[PDB]
Design a protein around this ligand. Sequence first.
Ligand SMILES: *[C@@H]1O[C@H](CO)[C@@H](O[C@@H]2O[C@H](CO)[C@@H](O)[C@H](O)[C@H]2NC(C)=O)[C@H](O)[C@H]1NC(C)=O
Lengths: 49, 49
Amino acid sequence: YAWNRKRISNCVADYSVLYNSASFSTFKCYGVSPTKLNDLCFTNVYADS
Amino acid sequence: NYNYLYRLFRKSNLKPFERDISTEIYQAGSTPCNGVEGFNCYFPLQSYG
Ligand SMILES: *[C@@H]1O[C@H](CO)[C@@H](O[C@@H]2O[C@H](CO)[C@@H](O)[C@H](O)[C@H]2NC(C)=O)[C@H](O)[C@H]1NC(C)=O
């Protein structure tokens, strides 16, 4: 109920090391796809952990 | 009635007036998808709710 919010901007949101890693168990993008994530540009991304 | 099925993953967009009935499992990552299943191997066909 007090999830932290970290603003991520002005960087490259690389996902090779993220997706190719087997550490994660479940990961679904319901609005985008990893294949087109590389060639897509975003304004700001917040991480809520 | 879930008998209606539709394809979800494809290697590339199908050309006009093309029929695709292949049932081989799809791989969303760089890792190989051998056999009938594997890491993040998704069946191309999803039922209709
Ligand atoms: C932070 O998390 C990442 C996990 O992605 C660790 O870096 C490597 O990530 C790749 C994924 O491609 C793995 O193959 C490596 O095994 C990871 N290296 C390890 C586990 O040492 C990174 O080490 C982590 N940093 C920490 C825990 O301090």
